[PDB]
Paper text:
Variable-heavy-heavy domains (VHHs) or nanobodies are single-domain heavy-chain only fragments found in members of the camelidae family (camels, llamas, alpacas, etc.). To explore antibody applications beyond traditional heavy-light chain mAbs, we identified and biophysically characterized a novel single-domain antibody specific for fentanyl from a camelid variable-heavy-heavy (VHH) domain phage display library. Our lead VHH (JGFN4) was specific for fentanyl and displayed no cross-reactivity with the closely related synthetic opioid carfentanil. The recognition of the fentanyl by JGFN4 was driven by hydrophobic interactions between the bottom of the binding pocket with the N-phenylpropanimide moiety and hydrogen bonding with a tertiary amine in the piperidine ring.
JGFN4 expressed in E. coli was purified as a mixture of monomers and non-covalent homodimers, separable by size-exclusion chromatography. Both the monomeric and non-covalent dimeric forms of JGFN4 were subjected to crystallization screening and yielded crystals in the presence of fentanyl. The structures were determined by molecular replacement phasing and refined to 1.68 and 1.55-Å resolution for crystals obtained with the monomeric and dimeric species, respectively. Unexpectedly, both crystal structures showed a domain-swapped homodimer of JGFN4, with each protomer bound to one fentanyl molecule. Interestingly, the homodimer formed as a result of reciprocal swapping of the C-terminal β-strand of each protomer, mediated by an extended conformation and intermolecular interaction of CDR3. Fentanyl was surrounded by CDR1, CDR2, and a juxtaposed loop between CDR2 and CDR3, which formed a turn of a helix. In CDR2, R53 also donates a hydrogen bond to the carbonyl oxygen atom of fentanyl and to the S29 carbonyl group from CDR1 to help shape the pocket. Hydrogen bonding is also observed between N76 and the tertiary amine nitrogen atom of the piperidine moiety on fentanyl. The piperidine ring is also stabilized by extensive van der Waals contacts with protein residues from CDR1 and the short helix between CDR2 and CDR3 mentioned above. Of particular interest is N32 from CDR1, whose side chain undergoes a ∼4.5 Å shift upon the transition of CDR3 from the cis to trans conformations. In the trans conformation, L100 from the straightened CDR3 formed bidentate hydrogen bonds with the side chain of N32, which accompanies a ∼3 Å shift of the Cα position to shape the fentanyl-binding pocket. Using X-ray crystallography, we found that JGFN4 WT dimerized and bound fentanyl through an unusual domain-swapping mechanism.
Author numbering:
A (entry chain A), B (entry chain A): 0 to 113
The structure:
Amino acid sequence: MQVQLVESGGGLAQAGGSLQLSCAASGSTSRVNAMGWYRQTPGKERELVAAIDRSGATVYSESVRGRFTISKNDAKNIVWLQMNNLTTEDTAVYYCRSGVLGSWGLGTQVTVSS
Amino acid sequence: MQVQLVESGGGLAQAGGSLQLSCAASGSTSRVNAMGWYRQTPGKERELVAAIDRSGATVYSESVRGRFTISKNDAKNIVWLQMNNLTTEDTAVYYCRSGVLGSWGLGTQVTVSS
Ligand SMILES: CCC(=O)N(c1ccccc1)C1CCN(CCc2ccccc2)CC1
Ligand SMILES: CCC(=O)N(c1ccccc1)C1CCN(CCc2ccccc2)CC1
């Protein structure tokens, strides 16, 4: 029922180097309009690293801004995490997670003057 | 079927001031383990401002880091966006959006040496 995800990439890198992770979705992909990467370093809580939605909007944790990039190939149903300028603080297990985001409401208008 | 969201807050603020937005969920809330705030300034694409998942992990766009805080009351099924140190660049329509995030995989191990 849920979309099937296969996570690839990772292994060893040198400090200063780069790695690319990938996550391939298959099965019930039509409803999936969000994908995200988390990580967990030993002893610490799992944290959200990067996320992307179907429109291409992206968001990153402070700890990886500018160094990591999340991208997608919509037709292949694959998302990548490019990880640049690595340090030993990036050692962790990385998790790909799917999401189904809901409909748009009307929203609320915010006007800031002066 | 989908969770019902009611967005509140917003209106006018002065530059330098603060506002708090809120979004109240009801109905099919049990499956909802992510909530997010987007915004759209006129003529620009809608962008992801802040998101939170059931574990409390949060993520922010670069443009609001440190000024905006997303929080939740799990028992009331309400999320808030506290917006501090506003500027005219924060004028926009703000949208609350729900999400259902998938199961955890085993992940991939990344080890950075030296
Ligand atoms: C942000 C996530 C997202 O929106 N998706 C996604 C999911 C997992 C990994 C990468 C992207 C979509 C899932 C559905 N596919 C449909 C592809 C298609 C369309 C028309 C004909 C044939 C095939 C589009 C991308
Ligand atoms: C990150 C989103 C999230 O995970 N949620 C959420 C959804 C919308 C807005 C705020 C938070 C949960 C939705 C379900 N509620 C159940 C509450 C409950 C539990 C036990 C007995 C009685 C009531 C917990 C919070």
